[PDB]
Structure formats: structure tokens, C-alpha cells
Design an enzyme around this catalytic site. Structure first.
Site, PDB file in Angstrom:
ATOM      1  CG  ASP A 165      15.154  30.122 118.527  1.00  0.00           C
ATOM      2  OD1 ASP A 165      16.187  29.912 119.634  1.00  0.00           O
ATOM      3  OD2 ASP A 165      14.048  29.337 119.359  1.00  0.00           O
ATOM      4  CG  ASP A 208       0.518  26.685 113.303  1.00  0.00           C
ATOM      5  OD1 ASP A 208      -0.508  27.052 111.742  1.00  0.00           O
ATOM      6  OD2 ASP A 208       0.729  27.656 114.336  1.00  0.00           O
ATOM      7  CG  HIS A 229       7.905  31.559 111.317  1.00  0.00           C
ATOM      8  ND1 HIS A 229       7.682  32.538 110.779  1.00  0.00           N
ATOM      9  CD2 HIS A 229       6.569  31.156 110.557  1.00  0.00           C
ATOM     10  CE1 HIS A 229       6.783  33.323 110.423  1.00  0.00           C
ATOM     11  NE2 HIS A 229       6.324  32.194 109.703  1.00  0.00           N
ATOM     12  CD  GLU A 265       1.072  27.234 107.642  1.00  0.00           C
ATOM     13  OE1 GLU A 265       1.354  27.787 108.931  1.00  0.00           O
ATOM     14  OE2 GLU A 265       0.125  28.259 107.336  1.00  0.00           O
ATOM     15  CE1 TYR A 290      -0.621  27.932  76.236  1.00  0.00           C
ATOM     16  CE2 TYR A 290       0.897  25.975  77.253  1.00  0.00           C
ATOM     17  CZ  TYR A 290       0.411  26.767  76.031  1.00  0.00           C
ATOM     18  OH  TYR A 290       0.385  25.700  75.261  1.00  0.00           O
ATOM     19  CG  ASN A 320       5.819  30.565 116.387  1.00  0.00           C
ATOM     20  OD1 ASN A 320       7.155  30.461 116.043  1.00  0.00           O
ATOM     21  ND2 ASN A 320       5.337  31.481 116.607  1.00  0.00           N
ATOM     22  CG  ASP A 328       9.527  33.100 118.987  1.00  0.00           C
ATOM     23  OD1 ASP A 328       9.227  32.614 117.751  1.00  0.00           O
ATOM     24  OD2 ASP A 328      11.420  33.161 118.879  1.00  0.00           O
ATOM     25  N   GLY A 351      -7.895  32.279  84.417  1.00  0.00           N
ATOM     26  CA  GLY A 351      -7.619  31.542  83.074  1.00  0.00           C
ATOM     27  C   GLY A 351      -5.767  31.196  83.251  1.00  0.00           C
TER      28      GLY A 351
HETATM   29  C1  LIG Z   1      -5.937  41.109 129.120  1.00  0.00           C
HETATM   30  C2  LIG Z   1      -5.339  39.583 129.000  1.00  0.00           C
HETATM   31  O1  LIG Z   1      -4.058  40.602 129.427  1.00  0.00           O
HETATM   32  C3  LIG Z   1      -2.804  39.454 129.379  1.00  0.00           C
HETATM   33  O2  LIG Z   1      -3.089  38.718 127.905  1.00  0.00           O
HETATM   34  C4  LIG Z   1      -1.535  39.529 127.411  1.00  0.00           C
HETATM   35  C5  LIG Z   1      -1.223  37.869 126.283  1.00  0.00           C
HETATM   36  O3  LIG Z   1      -1.305  37.012 127.176  1.00  0.00           O
HETATM   37  C6  LIG Z   1      -0.130  38.494 125.586  1.00  0.00           C
HETATM   38  O4  LIG Z   1       0.299  37.308 124.977  1.00  0.00           O
HETATM   39  C7  LIG Z   1      -0.024  39.251 124.722  1.00  0.00           C
HETATM   40  O5  LIG Z   1      -0.813  39.241 123.401  1.00  0.00           O
HETATM   41  C8  LIG Z   1      -0.596  39.626 122.414  1.00  0.00           C
HETATM   42  C9  LIG Z   1      -2.255  39.785 121.896  1.00  0.00           C
HETATM   43  C10 LIG Z   1      -3.355  39.849 122.564  1.00  0.00           C
HETATM   44  O6  LIG Z   1      -4.381  40.307 121.497  1.00  0.00           O
HETATM   45  C11 LIG Z   1      -2.450  40.414 120.401  1.00  0.00           C
HETATM   46  C12 LIG Z   1      -1.277  39.726 119.356  1.00  0.00           C
HETATM   47  N1  LIG Z   1      -1.584  37.594 119.027  1.00  0.00           N
HETATM   48  C13 LIG Z   1      -2.652  37.753 117.902  1.00  0.00           C
HETATM   49  C14 LIG Z   1      -2.631  37.532 116.224  1.00  0.00           C
HETATM   50  O7  LIG Z   1      -1.301  39.125 116.214  1.00  0.00           O
HETATM   51  C15 LIG Z   1      -3.385  38.346 115.663  1.00  0.00           C
HETATM   52  O8  LIG Z   1      -3.310  38.277 114.631  1.00  0.00           O
HETATM   53  C16 LIG Z   1      -4.455  36.847 115.226  1.00  0.00           C
HETATM   54  O9  LIG Z   1      -3.483  35.974 115.098  1.00  0.00           O
HETATM   55  C17 LIG Z   1      -4.237  34.563 114.858  1.00  0.00           C
HETATM   56  C18 LIG Z   1      -3.606  34.833 113.639  1.00  0.00           C
HETATM   57  O10 LIG Z   1      -4.416  35.754 112.820  1.00  0.00           O
HETATM   58  C19 LIG Z   1      -4.830  33.608 112.559  1.00  0.00           C
HETATM   59  O11 LIG Z   1      -4.347  33.918 111.285  1.00  0.00           O
HETATM   60  C20 LIG Z   1      -3.984  31.963 113.138  1.00  0.00           C
HETATM   61  O12 LIG Z   1      -2.743  32.064 112.861  1.00  0.00           O
HETATM   62  C21 LIG Z   1      -2.161  30.385 112.394  1.00  0.00           C
HETATM   63  C22 LIG Z   1      -0.568  30.474 112.766  1.00  0.00           C
HETATM   64  C23 LIG Z   1      -0.878  31.409 114.337  1.00  0.00           C
HETATM   65  O13 LIG Z   1      -0.295  29.946 114.866  1.00  0.00           O
HETATM   66  C24 LIG Z   1      -0.216  30.397 111.522  1.00  0.00           C
HETATM   67  C25 LIG Z   1      -0.332  29.532 110.679  1.00  0.00           C
HETATM   68  N2  LIG Z   1      -0.616  30.320 108.909  1.00  0.00           N
HETATM   69  C26 LIG Z   1       0.834  31.203 108.696  1.00  0.00           C
HETATM   70  C27 LIG Z   1       1.489  30.875 108.710  1.00  0.00           C
HETATM   71  O14 LIG Z   1       2.536  29.950 109.145  1.00  0.00           O
HETATM   72  C28 LIG Z   1       3.486  32.146 108.567  1.00  0.00           C
HETATM   73  O15 LIG Z   1       4.146  32.101 107.782  1.00  0.00           O
HETATM   74  C29 LIG Z   1       2.209  33.482 107.466  1.00  0.00           C
HETATM   75  O16 LIG Z   1       2.410  33.072 106.362  1.00  0.00           O
HETATM   76  C30 LIG Z   1       2.526  33.944 105.697  1.00  0.00           C
HETATM   77  C31 LIG Z   1       4.016  33.500 105.195  1.00  0.00           C
HETATM   78  O17 LIG Z   1       5.009  33.851 106.160  1.00  0.00           O
HETATM   79  C32 LIG Z   1       4.326  34.940 104.461  1.00  0.00           C
HETATM   80  O18 LIG Z   1       5.905  34.626 103.215  1.00  0.00           O
HETATM   81  C33 LIG Z   1       3.634  35.783 102.831  1.00  0.00           C
HETATM   82  O19 LIG Z   1       3.214  34.156 101.976  1.00  0.00           O
HETATM   83  C34 LIG Z   1       3.967  35.006 101.143  1.00  0.00           C
HETATM   84  C35 LIG Z   1       4.932  33.364 100.276  1.00  0.00           C
HETATM   85  O20 LIG Z   1       5.768  33.315 100.820  1.00  0.00           O
HETATM   86  C36 LIG Z   1       5.209  34.447  98.864  1.00  0.00           C
HETATM   87  O21 LIG Z   1       6.000  32.698  98.469  1.00  0.00           O
HETATM   88  C37 LIG Z   1       3.898  34.241  98.060  1.00  0.00           C
HETATM   89  O22 LIG Z   1       4.299  34.658  96.478  1.00  0.00           O
HETATM   90  O23 LIG Z   1       3.248  35.289  98.290  1.00  0.00           O
HETATM   91  C38 LIG Z   1       2.872  34.634 100.150  1.00  0.00           C
HETATM   92  C39 LIG Z   1       1.805  36.466 100.634  1.00  0.00           C
HETATM   93  O24 LIG Z   1       0.602  35.025 100.733  1.00  0.00           O
HETATM   94  O25 LIG Z   1       2.488  35.584 104.041  1.00  0.00           O
HETATM   95  C40 LIG Z   1       1.538  34.967 104.704  1.00  0.00           C
HETATM   96  C41 LIG Z   1       0.333  34.920 104.728  1.00  0.00           C
HETATM   97  O26 LIG Z   1      -0.261  36.102 106.036  1.00  0.00           O
HETATM   98  O27 LIG Z   1       1.281  33.671 108.011  1.00  0.00           O
HETATM   99  C42 LIG Z   1       0.237  32.164 108.671  1.00  0.00           C
HETATM  100  C43 LIG Z   1      -1.173  32.787 108.580  1.00  0.00           C
HETATM  101  C44 LIG Z   1      -2.113  28.937 110.816  1.00  0.00           C
HETATM  102  O28 LIG Z   1      -2.502  27.215 110.273  1.00  0.00           O
HETATM  103  C45 LIG Z   1      -2.230  29.946 111.071  1.00  0.00           C
HETATM  104  O29 LIG Z   1      -4.162  29.682 111.250  1.00  0.00           O
HETATM  105  O30 LIG Z   1      -4.521  32.542 114.466  1.00  0.00           O
HETATM  106  C46 LIG Z   1      -3.424  33.610 115.016  1.00  0.00           C
HETATM  107  C47 LIG Z   1      -3.572  33.553 117.000  1.00  0.00           C
HETATM  108  O31 LIG Z   1      -5.115  32.651 117.717  1.00  0.00           O
HETATM  109  O32 LIG Z   1      -5.008  36.266 117.251  1.00  0.00           O
HETATM  110  C48 LIG Z   1      -3.831  37.315 118.600  1.00  0.00           C
HETATM  111  C49 LIG Z   1      -4.398  36.706 119.598  1.00  0.00           C
HETATM  112  C50 LIG Z   1       0.116  39.057 119.787  1.00  0.00           C
HETATM  113  O33 LIG Z   1       0.638  38.653 118.992  1.00  0.00           O
HETATM  114  C51 LIG Z   1       0.336  38.456 121.523  1.00  0.00           C
HETATM  115  O34 LIG Z   1       2.225  38.763 121.867  1.00  0.00           O
HETATM  116  O35 LIG Z   1      -0.331  40.966 125.373  1.00  0.00           O
HETATM  117  C52 LIG Z   1      -1.456  40.034 125.927  1.00  0.00           C
HETATM  118  C53 LIG Z   1      -2.387  41.487 127.086  1.00  0.00           C
HETATM  119  O36 LIG Z   1      -2.802  42.624 125.698  1.00  0.00           O
HETATM  120  C54 LIG Z   1      -3.538  38.525 130.119  1.00  0.00           C
HETATM  121  O37 LIG Z   1      -2.263  37.070 129.735  1.00  0.00           O
HETATM  122  C55 LIG Z   1      -4.274  37.422 130.117  1.00  0.00           C
HETATM  123  O38 LIG Z   1      -4.846  36.481 130.236  1.00  0.00           O
HETATM  124  C56 LIG Z   1      -5.514  38.203 129.734  1.00  0.00           C
HETATM  125  O39 LIG Z   1      -7.359  38.114 129.418  1.00  0.00           O
HETATM  126  O1  LIG Z   2      18.780  31.514 109.879  1.00  0.00           O
HETATM  127  C1  LIG Z   2      17.944  32.468 111.163  1.00  0.00           C
HETATM  128  C2  LIG Z   2      18.570  33.210 112.022  1.00  0.00           C
HETATM  129  O2  LIG Z   2      17.854  34.271 111.974  1.00  0.00           O
HETATM  130  C3  LIG Z   2      18.033  35.229 112.668  1.00  0.00           C
HETATM  131  O3  LIG Z   2      18.804  36.270 113.271  1.00  0.00           O
HETATM  132  C4  LIG Z   2      19.059  34.155 114.310  1.00  0.00           C
HETATM  133  O4  LIG Z   2      19.708  35.060 114.986  1.00  0.00           O
HETATM  134  C5  LIG Z   2      20.280  33.533 113.389  1.00  0.00           C
HETATM  135  O5  LIG Z   2      20.806  33.030 113.681  1.00  0.00           O
HETATM  136  C6  LIG Z   2      19.399  32.473 112.712  1.00  0.00           C
HETATM  137  O6  LIG Z   2      20.702  31.813 111.659  1.00  0.00           O
HETATM  138 CA   LIG Z   3       9.325  31.227 117.022  1.00  0.00          CA
HETATM  139 CA   LIG Z   4      -6.247  28.470  79.446  1.00  0.00          CA
HETATM  140 CA   LIG Z   5      16.912  31.578 120.990  1.00  0.00          CA
HETATM  141 NA    NA Z   6      12.961  31.618 119.626  1.00  0.00          NA
END
Ligand SMILES: C[C@H]1O[C@H](O[C@H]2[C@H](O)[C@@H](O)[C@@H](O[C@@H]3C(CO)=C[C@H](N[C@H]4[C@H](O)[C@@H](O)[C@@H](O[C@H]5[C@H](O)[C@@H](O)[C@@H](O[C@@H]6C(CO)=C[C@H](N[C@H]7[C@H](O)[C@@H](O)[C@@H](O[C@H]8[C@H](O)[C@@H](O)[C@@H](O[C@H]9[C@H](O)[C@@H](O)[C@H](O)O[C@@H]9CO)O[C@@H]8CO)O[C@@H]7C)[C@H](O)[C@H]6O)O[C@@H]5CO)O[C@@H]4C)[C@H](O)[C@H]3O)O[C@@H]2CO)[C@H](O)[C@@H](O)[C@@H]1O
Ligand SMILES: OC[C@H]1O[C@H](O)[C@H](O)[C@@H](O)[C@@H]1O
Ligand SMILES: [Ca+2]
Ligand SMILES: [Ca+2]
Ligand SMILES: [Ca+2]
Ligand code: NA
Ligand SMILES: C[C@H]1O[C@H](O[C@H]2[C@H](O)[C@@H](O)[C@@H](O[C@H]3[C@H](O)[C@@H](O)[C@H](O)O[C@@H]3CO)O[C@@H]2CO)[C@H](O)[C@@H](O)[C@@H]1N[C@H]1C=C(CO)[C@@H](O)[C@H](O)[C@H]1O
Ligand SMILES: OC[C@H]1O[C@H](O)[C@H](O)[C@@H](O)[C@@H]1O
Ligand SMILES: [Ca+2]
Length: 585
Positions: free
Chosen positions: A291, A336, A340, A366, A406, A218, A305, A404
């Protein structure tokens, strides 16, 4: 005070018929063993000729020949050196020695998720130092994993992440660096070097275990450099402003090995960080568009992204997938964050990877969607027949069970029970996101976890997954091994629902294969807490057959009648409220 400190085996254990002694360890030195019996509980017979020896506070009991499948009780009355008297017992069950012979091609599939979030951190590092080199550990454990019945392992992402040696793997920096290049402060990943990974793959393959890669397509993080980027007038935040975005990836440690592709802002749709203002946001780059995703506007999650409308990006990531399977010898993938990622790209990537080799590549997405209908819709929208998904809907029932549920509704729960989609469910109880110490996204299945495992491991549909934290860290191995035995040898043939489920008991039947002797099972699970044994009249589909409970819980046999019915039993407790009845012969 005089009490039993521990025993080998522990009460409730399943043991080999080769076991030669029972060891009892008491709190005080023992002067006399007054009474001792080893009783076969099914026939109600005491085994003649058993011996004992006292050594301080230990009593060693031997001189017996255990019968496979039998439940035993060792009862004792001891007197300590202070004249305190203690009466007690332990109970255990002997493993079957002669299992049903399942043709190699029909053996059930079972996945191990071979990691957790906190591995090699904090107290886990001290208590489980072997996990500091996970690829080496998996190579060491491959034979035992195979013996336990696992047929596949899901590895944590094995490429280099932004946090270097500390990355669990989801902070994707460079897909092409599997712990081979000096990037992000380390050559190895958290888990080991590329060579250690290849050794693990070969050792796992040596034991007929498939290996799946956790692909994080992603986003990218840990850019080598930042760029000035104009945001689109359609951007939610800062439209029409220049930001400074971390979008420059040239992988200088790798120096072009495997792939000469480099990334810049034209490879990304957007980002959540502006290094000028030091403000988070949802920033869409000029002329980019999010996308196509199943849910509107769900492309952006975190990081920079990936723009999967960019053809050069598509080509590199397709090349990478093909490399992982055909050169690095993986057998499949977890995708993963699949919801998204452009669903057009997911489909195209899957088919291109599948088409590149004669190997039948496994794919599981996932898609964190807890409503079954929504998850079916997702599958319909990606439209790739090979895409399986984790059964988050079924896991929502396990969450219900915590206080609990059903239980009769387990007949219809989950994708695994959705007509036309059952075979695309990858069932599970917990993972690294649902069971972590801090910053979990949901409650874990902290009670009745065995019942949940028993349900997914005995089912005729889906592919179930065991979580490493449950098996090795929470120390559920001994109970889980019994369930894995059930799956490996007994959970075969068609599955049948029963007509007497209720609020507190769910039962389920596997009839076995008509041409395999001794397979089939009756599952009973319960969310009851009254602490009593309960029964249900069930059609096992095996007339005139004797069954025993391979969990050790119920110390009785059930012999079915001429129509296949018996009164099968389960204990109504959280701790022991599952039983799996299998044939004795
Ligand atoms: C100094 C430095 O300078 C430069 O550095 C720059 C970097 O280059 C730049 O990139 C940028 O960096 C930024 C930074 C810097 O710190 C941070 C930030 N990124 C953070 C992030 O914010 C933080 O959260 C964490 O991320 C980790 C995450 O916490 C972990 O859990 C783990 O995750 C993974 C994962 C991501 O790959 C995905 C998987 N599971 C996801 C799932 O896929 C997703 O959909 C979502 O699920 C939700 C459902 O979507 C949602 O609907 C709901 O679910 C409901 C359901 O749908 C209903 O049906 C039901 O009834 O209710 C449900 C409710 O539960 O909820 C779910 C759950 O939320 O989430 C799940 C978790 C996978 O399995 C996970 O494990 O890993 C993540 C990554 O580690 O950490 C990161 C870092 C910024 O985004 C980033 O841009 O800036 C810096 C400068 O600051 C230079 O480059 C360097 O060289 C220098 O050193
Ligand atoms: O389907 C996801 C939607 O999210 C965003 O708005 C995209 O730009 C749109 O093209 C897409 O279809
Ligand atoms: Ca994406
Ligand atoms: Ca029961
Ligand atoms: Ca695009
Ligand atoms: Na994209
Ligand atoms: C032994 C036990 O191990 C695991 O339980 C973990 C939880 O996963 C973890 O979150 C944390 O639990 C706390 C929980 O977060 C919080 O919501 C609650 O208020 O308090 C909990 C206690 O700290 O830590 C526990 C480990 O201590 C598994 O997830 C559990 O399923 C597992 N229980 C098994 C084992 C037994 C013992 O034989 C059964 O009795 C039980 O029913 C079964 O689920
Ligand atoms: O394209 C690679 C180069 O382009 C730039 O202008 C970056 O600032 C520099 O750090 C990078 O090495
Ligand atoms: Ca049979």
C-alpha cells in the site's frame, strides 16, 4: 547512631493548609526536644505557640495554622535516650487555597497514557496487584485523575490479541472482541472484560475525562487457520513459491456478533512467516502490492499485513471505528504504527469516523519519525486536518539532555515549535516503547525527566501526555502533581520566549489571560549540575506582581518591577533543576 528515619510530610513536600501535625521519626527513642521552631521563610518569622509531644522515637508537632503559598522550615534539636544530640530540619510548601478561576471551556487539556509494557508481570504484579484489573482500576481512580488535572486517558488496545490474557494489545486478533468472547484462551483481555471497560468509560465520563482507544490497524496475528498462498514474482523473498500463511480469521468465539466479516489471504498483502519451510521473510502475495506509505516500501512491519486496497476490508474497519465511537462511546483514537498504513486509507477512515457523529473525535498518530521536517512531510502526505502526531522530534532533545544539551535550543525544538504544525503535536517524554525494562527501542529519559515534563506541561501549544509508569511506578507523582497544578491553573494566555537563555538554562513565560486574576507563570529549567542557585532577569508580563516557586525548590519570592521584570531563580541540579514561578495572589 541518632538520625531522622522519616518525616510526614517529607522534606520538600507540598501540603494542604489543613495539615494539623508534623511527625518526625527518629532512629532512637527521644528523651528531650531541646529546640523547635516552625519558621515562615518568606517573612523570616517563627510561629509562636507550637506544641510537641514525644512518643518513643516519634515527635509530633502541632498547634499551628499554615498559610497557603508559604514556604516553611521546621527546625529541631533533639536528645536521645543515649545522650546523643541531633540538629536538623525539614522544609515544605503549602498549596494555594484560592486558585485562578479558569472558564471550563478554556481549561488546558492533558492526557494520561494509562498503561506500560510490563503491567501485571513479574515483580510489578506483586508490587502493584491492583493492575491485574486495569479497567476496574481506572474506574476507581477516575475522580483522582480528574482532580490531578487530566482531561483524557489513552487506554492500551482493548480488543483481543493473539497472546490472549498476556497480550499487551498490539498482537491484534479481533477488533470486535473487547473482552466479551471466548477467543485466544480467554474471555477477558489482559485489562478486563467488555463490561468492565464500559464501566470504566462511564466512570471516566462521570468525571469529565475523555477516553481514547489504541487502534492497531496495520496487521493481524493469531490466525484461526493457515492457507496456501502463491507469492508474487515481485516478492522480495520466495517470489513465485507457494507458502503456508496464517491468514484465515473467522472469529469462531464471536460467531458473527457485530460483524459477519471474515478474513482470508485476499484481505492481506503479505506476511513474514512460511509454515512450510519455517522460514521468516518478507513475502508479498500474488497480485498484491504494498500500500502507499509516506516512505517507500514501509507498508510491511509484522504479522499478516492488512491490504487497505481491498474495499471489503476498508468497509469493515471503517464500520469498527464508527462502532467504537458511537456505540462504545470512546472519544478518539491513537493510531498505532500509522506510518505503515496506507495514507489514503488513514485519511478516508478518519473522515468517515469523524463524519459519523457530532462528537469532535480526537486522533493522534504514532509516526516514529525523529526529524521535524520528515514528520511535517508525513502530515502533509496524509492531508487530514484532524491528524495529530506524537512529537518524537521534541523527545530527541530530551535524549540530548541526558548528558547535557544546549538548552537555549528548546526555543526551536520539536513539532510543537514548528510554525503551522504546533497545534498537531502531542508531546510526551516516554512511553511503553521508549521506557521498558528489556527490549526497549531507545534509551529512556532516565535523568532530567522532571525538566522535560515541566517543558511540555507549561507550553502554550501541543497536548501533553503523562506516562503511567512515571506517575505510578517510578513514583514521580508528587513532583508531577505540582507540574499538573501549574498546567491546570496557571499555564494560560500567550507564551513568550526570553532573550537570555544559554547553554544550561531555558526560561519561558505564560502571561495569563488579561481577564483572569492570578494566572500566568515563569518556567525555568536547567541541565546544570554545579548545585548552585542561578538567576535570570525575565519579563513576566505582570508588572508589580509577587511570584513564588510552586515546586518548593527556591525558598524566596520574586516581585517584579513596573515593567514586569524580575530575577527568577532555579537550582542547577539534575534532581531539582526546574522551577515554576506563579503569582501568590
Ligand atoms: C502456534 C500458533 O500458530 C499460529 O500462529 C501464527 C500466527 O498466527 C502468525 O500471525 C505468525 O505470527 C508471527 C509471530 C509468532 O510468534 C511473530 C512475529 N511477530 C512478533 C514480532 O516480530 C515481535 O517483535 C513482537 O512484536 C511486538 C513488538 O515487539 C512490541 O514492541 C509491540 O509493538 C507495537 C507495534 C506493533 O503493533 C507498533 C508500535 N511502535 C512501533 C512503530 O510504529 C514502528 O514504526 C517501529 O518504529 C521504528 C521506526 O519506524 C524506525 O524508523 C526507527 O526509528 C528511527 C527514527 O525513524 C529516526 O528518525 C531516528 O533518528 O532513529 C529512530 C530509531 O529509534 O526505529 C523505530 C523503533 O524500532 O517500531 C515501533 C516499536 C507500538 O507502540 C508497539 O508497542 O507489540 C508487537 C506485537 O505484540 O511480537 C510479535 C508476536 C511475526 O511478525 C508474526 O507473523 O506465525 C504464527 C506461527 O509461528 C496460530 O495462529 C496460533 O493460533 C497458534 O497458537
Ligand atoms: O509509497 C509507498 C510505496 O511503497 C511500496 O513500494 C508501494 O507498492 C508503492 O506503491 C508505494 O507508493
Ligand atoms: Ca502495513
Ligand atoms: Ca547544557
Ligand atoms: Ca495492497
Ligand atoms: Na498492506
Ligand atoms: C526514578 C527514575 O525512574 C525512571 O528511571 C528508570 C529508567 O527509565 C529505566 O530504564 C532504568 O534506568 C536504567 C537505565 O535503563 C540505564 O540506561 C542506566 O544505565 O541505568 C538506569 C538505572 O537502572 O530504571 C530507572 C528506575 O530505577 C525514570 O525514567 C527516571 O527519569 C526517574 N528519574 C527522575 C527522578 C529523580 C529522583 O528525584 C530525578 O533525580 C531524575 O533526574 C528524574 O529524571
Ligand atoms: O473458511 C473457513 C474454513 O476454511 C478452511 O478450508 C480452513 O482450513 C478451515 O479451518 C476453516 O474453518
Ligand atoms: Ca491574568
Amino acid at each position: 547512631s541518632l538520625f531522622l528515619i522519616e518525616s510526614e510530610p517529607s522534606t520538600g513536600a507540598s501540603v494542604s493548609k489543613n495539615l494539623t501535625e508534623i511527625i518526625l521519626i527518629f532512629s532512637n527513642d527521644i528523651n528531650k526536644v531541646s529546640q523547635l521552631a516552625l519558621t515562615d521563610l518568606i517573612t523570616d518569622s517563627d510561629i509562636q505557640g507550637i506544641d510537641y509531644n514525644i512518643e518513643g522515637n516519634k515527635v509530633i508537632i502541632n498547634n499551628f495554622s499554615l498559610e497557603p503559598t508559604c514556604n516553611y522550615r521546621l527546625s529541631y534539636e533533639v536528645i536521645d535516650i543515649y545522650d546523643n544530640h541531633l540538629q536538623g530540619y525539614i522544609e515544605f510548601l503549602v498549596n494555594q487555597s484560592n486558585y485562578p478561576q479558569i472558564p471550563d471551556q478554556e481549561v488546558n487539556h492533558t492526557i494520561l497514557q494509562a498503561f506500560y509494557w510490563e503491567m501485571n508481570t513479574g515483580e510489578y504484579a506483586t508490587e502493584h496487584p491492583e493492575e491485574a484489573n486495569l479497567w476496574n482500576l481506572l474506574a476507581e481512580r477516575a475522580p483522582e485523575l480528574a482532580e490531578a488535572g487530566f482531561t483524557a486517558v489513552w487506554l492500551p488496545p482493548a480488543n483481543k490479541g493473539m497472546a490472549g490474557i498476556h497480550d499487551v494489545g498490539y498482537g491484534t486478533y479481533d477488533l470486535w472482541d473487547l473482552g466479551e468472547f471466548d477467543q485466544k484462551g480467554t474471555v477477558r483481555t489482559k485489562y478486563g472484560t467488555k463490561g468492565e471497560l464500559e464501566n470504566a468509560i462511564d466512570a471516566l465520563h462521570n468525571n469529565d475525562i475523555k477516553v481514547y482507544f489504541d487502534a492497531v490497524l496495520n496487521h493481524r496475528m493469531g490466525a484461526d487457520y493457515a492457507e496456501t498462498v502463491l507469492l508474487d514474482e515481485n516478492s522480495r523473498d520466495k517470489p513465485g513459491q507457494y507458502i503456508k500463511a496464517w491468514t484465515g480469521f473467522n472469529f469462531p468465539g464471536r460467531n458473527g456478533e457485530y460483524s459477519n466479516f471474515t478474513w482470508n489471504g485476499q484481505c492481506f498483502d503479505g506476511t513474514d512467516w512460511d509454515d512450510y519451510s519455517k522460514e521468516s521473510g518478507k513475502y508479498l502475495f500474488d497480485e498484491k502490492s504494498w500500500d502507499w506509505t509516506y516512505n517507500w516500501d514501509e507498508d510491511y512491519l509484522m504479522g499478516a499485513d492488512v491490504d487497505y486496497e481491498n474495499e471489503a476490508v476498508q468497509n469493515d474497519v471503517i464500520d469498527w471505528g464508527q462502532w467504537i465511537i458511537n456505540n462504545i462511546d470512546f472519544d478518539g483514537f491513537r493510531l498505532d504504527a500509522v506510518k505503515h498504513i496506507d495514507y489514503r486509507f488513514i485519511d478516508k477512515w478518519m473522515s468517515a469516523v469523524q463524519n459519523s457523529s457530532n462528537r469532535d473525535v480526537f486522533f493522534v498518530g504514532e509516526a516514529w519519525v525523529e526529524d521535524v521536517d520528515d514528520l511535517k512531510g508525513f502530515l502533509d502526505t496524509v492531508g487530514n486536518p484532524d491528524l495529530r502526531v506524537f512529537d518524537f522530534p521534541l523527545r530527541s532533545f530530551f535524549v540530548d539532555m541526558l548528558n547535557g544539551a544546549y538548552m537555549a535550543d528548546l526555543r526551536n525544538a520539536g513539532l510543537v515549535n514548528s510554525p503551522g504544525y504546533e497545534n498537531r503535536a502531542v508531546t510526551f517524554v516516554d512511553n511503553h516503547d521508549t521506557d521498558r525494562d528489556e527490549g526497549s527501542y531507545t534509551v529512556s529519559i532516565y535523568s532530567r525527566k522532571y525538566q522535560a515534563y515541566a517543558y511540555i506541561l507549561t507550553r502554550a501549544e501541543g497536548v501533553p501526555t503523562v506516562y503511567w509508569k512515571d506517575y505510578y511506578i517510578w513514583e514521580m507523582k508528587e513532583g508531577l502533581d505540582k507540574l499538573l497544578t501549574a498546567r491546570r491553573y496557571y499555564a494560560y494566555g500567550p507564551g513568550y520566549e526570553v532573550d537570555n537563555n544559554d547553554a544550561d538554562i531555558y526560561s519561558y513565560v505564560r502571561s495569563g489571560f488579561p481577564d483572569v486574576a492570578g494566572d500566568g507563570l515563569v518556567l525555568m529549567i536547567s541541565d546544570g549540575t554545579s548545585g548552585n542557585v542561578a538567576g535570570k532577569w525575565i519579563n513576566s508580563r505582570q508588572p508589580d506582581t509577587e511570584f513564588y516557586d510552586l515546586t518548593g525548590h527556591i525558598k524566596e519570592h520574586v516581585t517584579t518591577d513596573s515593567e514586569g521584570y524580575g530575577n527568577f531563580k532555579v537550582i542547577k541540579s539534575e534532581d531539582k533543576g526546574w522551577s515554576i514561578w506563579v503569582p501568590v495572589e
